[PDB]
Amino acid sequence: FEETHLTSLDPVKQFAAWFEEAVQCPDIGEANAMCLATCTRDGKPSARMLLLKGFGKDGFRFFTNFESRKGKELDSNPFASLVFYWEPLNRQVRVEGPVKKLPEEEAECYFHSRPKSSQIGAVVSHQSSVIPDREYLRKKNEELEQLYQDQEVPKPKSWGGYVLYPQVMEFWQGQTNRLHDWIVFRRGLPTPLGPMTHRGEEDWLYERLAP
Amino acid sequence: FEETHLTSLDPVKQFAAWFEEAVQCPDIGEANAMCLATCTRDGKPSARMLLLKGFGKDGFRFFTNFESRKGKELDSNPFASLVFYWEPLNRQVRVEGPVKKLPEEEAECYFHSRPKSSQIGAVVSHQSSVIPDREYLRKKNEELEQLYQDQEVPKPKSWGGYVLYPQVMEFWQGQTNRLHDWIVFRRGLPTPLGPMTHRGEEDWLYERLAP
Numbered sequence: 001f002e003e004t005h006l007t008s009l010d011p012v013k014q015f016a017a018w019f020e021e022a023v024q025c026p027d028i029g030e031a032n033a034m035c036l037a038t039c040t041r042d043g044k045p046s047a048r049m050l051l052l053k054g055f056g057k058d059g060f061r062f063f064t065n066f067e068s069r070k071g072k073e074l075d076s077n078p079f080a081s082l083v084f085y086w087e088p089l090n091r092q093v094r095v096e097g098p099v100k101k102l103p104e105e106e107a108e109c110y111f112h113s114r115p116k117s118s119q120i121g122a123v124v125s126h127q128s129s130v131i132p133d134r135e136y137l138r139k140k141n142e143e144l145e146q147l148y149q150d151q152e153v154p155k156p157k158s159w160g161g162y163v164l165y166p167q168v169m170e171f172w173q174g175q176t177n178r179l180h181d182w183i184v185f186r187r188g189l190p191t192p193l194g195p196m197t198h199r200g201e202e203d204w205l206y207e208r209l210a211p
Numbered sequence: 212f213e214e215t216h217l218t219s220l221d222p223v224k225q226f227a228a229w230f231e232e233a234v235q236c237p238d239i240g241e242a243n244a245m246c247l248a249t250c251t252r253d254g255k256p257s258a259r260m261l262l263l264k265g266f267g268k269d270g271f272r273f274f275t276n277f278e279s280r281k282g283k284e285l286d287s288n289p290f291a292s293l294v295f296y297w298e299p300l301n302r303q304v305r306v307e308g309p310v311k312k313l314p315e316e317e318a319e320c321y322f323h324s325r326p327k328s329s330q331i332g333a334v335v336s337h338q339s340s341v342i343p344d345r346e347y348l349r350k351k352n353e354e355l356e357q358l359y360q361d362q363e364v365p366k367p368k369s370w371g372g373y374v375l376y377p378q379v380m381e382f383w384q385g386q387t388n389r390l391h392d393w394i395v396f397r398r399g400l401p402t403p404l405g406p407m408t409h410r411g412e413e414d415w416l417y418e419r420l421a422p
């Protein structure tokens with residue numbers, strides 16, 4: 001089938017190829033940078049930049065302080081959305097799915113893998129809490145350094161990670177002539193579908209949408 | 212007051228200075244590019260890249276098709292969030308507030324100001340609708356071109372814009388040493404506040420948060 005213009009009928013394997021091309025682009029510094037959208041049960045959205053830390057069949061992984069705004073929103077409403085935008089390539093990737101907090105064990109393993117300065121940073125910074133000035137931090141940070149000198153920084157109880165499980169993945173490719181390519185993968189049932197709806201690996205269904 | 216490190220105690224005037232420095236950066240192509248987060252009344256978030264089209268005291272303006280997913284979510288739940296990320300500067304700006312659809316008249320004025328090709332593009336592209344292949348569009352687009360040759364492209368009824376009214380604005384500045392600067396402006400009452408809470412212009416209140 002002279003196909004669409006994709007590399008894989010697997011949304012995650014497609015993200016991979018696009019992600020690698022981004023990593024290999026000199027003009028993109030943080031290719032794993034993504035904007036995470038979350039909201040309260042009520043319907044009040046929020047969004048902030050984040051770094052994607054590992055991905056695959058299980059989903060997209062990221063870490064934060066469970067007590068940060070995003071944490072308190074994901075825990076009281078396990079639904080999130082991700083947006084990857086790589087301007088140099090004019091590409092955008094959107095991921096929608098339910099979030100599942102990670103196992104404290106894995107978080108721990110990943111935590112101690114970070115640079116000591118990043119670990120210490122996660123302890124002084126009671127993320128999302130109010131403070132007096134930028135020095136307050138420079139100070140605490142300094143103190144905890146001498147404290148944990150030749151020591152293991154314990155992973156804050158409230159520090160961990162989540163993994164988004166891909167329910168909907170979109171691929172956008174800006175074109176010069178404005179007729180942007182746009183394919184949406186979504187997991188449907190009808191194991192019996194639209195004329196323009198096509199079969200993707202697993203229970204994946206894709207189709208092109210008007211830009 | 213040897214102040215924080217800002218340019219204005221006005222969140223919008225602060226965004227301005229940061230926005231201008233971005234526009235003047237050779238490494239940032241789309242400085243007005245932002246990720247818009249929205250959700251259903253239920254609490255299901257979504258997010259996609261967008262271009263900021265004008266801003267000020269009234270708020271942040273952007274245009275889309277009212278019948279696109281984002282439209283149907285903003286209309287049934289007038290709350291949105293914006294994220295501006297300028298990696299070359301390691302800066303992030305977050306805007307939270309209620310959305311108000313724009314006057315069809317202004318949309319019209321703005322619509323006809325766009326390049327004809329962009330206007331025609333908004334008519335062939337029944338944004339968010341399913342289609343067969345990329346040619347379907349190349350075709351419609353071509354046909355509407357000869358149609359509107361030496362003619363005014365009417366603004367689609369379902370085409371318009373919204374304006375976010377700044378209820379919460381955040382400024383993030385990544386630092387090398389990881390002790391990122393982060394100030395949050397929010398409109399409060401107590402016209403009588405925290406020790407680390409400071410007065411911003413109007414009914415604006417700001418404070419620094421642990422990164």
Ligand SMILES: Cc1cc2nc3c(=O)[nH]c(=O)nc-3n(C[C@H](O)[C@H](O)[C@H](O)COP(=O)(O)O)c2cc1C
Nearest residue numbers: 033048049050051063064065068069070071128303
């Ligand atoms: C490029 C970039 C990457 C970031 N990565 C993370 C991250 O992995 N985890 C995190 O908690 N915050 C990260 N942040 C900071 C968040 O955007 C945010 O300021 C913080 O998590 C608090 O948001 P919240 O109050 O919505 O929870 C990053 C910021 C930038 C600009």
Ligand SMILES: Cc1cc2nc3c(=O)[nH]c(=O)nc-3n(C[C@H](O)[C@H](O)[C@H](O)COP(=O)(O)O)c2cc1C
Nearest residue numbers: 092244259260261262274275276279280281282339
């Ligand atoms: C850099 C960039 C700028 C964009 N600007 C807009 C815009 O101003 N309005 C719009 O409707 N879509 C814009 N889009 C496309 C949206 O991200 C999205 O694909 C489209 O609006 C449909 O999203 P929705 O289905 O959530 O409504 C832009 C995409 C990129 C990558």
Ligand SMILES: Cc1ncc(COP(=O)(O)O)c(C=O)c1O
Nearest residue numbers: 030051114115118385389391422
């Ligand atoms: C808020 C924040 N924390 C941490 C990091 C990087 O830390 P790590 O050593 O875990 O990759 C970044 C990188 O941009 C960041 O923006």
Ligand SMILES: Cc1ncc(COP(=O)(O)O)c(C=O)c1O
Nearest residue numbers: 174178180211241262325326329
């Ligand atoms: C989806 C989309 N529409 C339109 C535009 C630009 O159109 P305009 O001439 O209104 O600035 C862009 C620019 O990136 C875009 O991504």
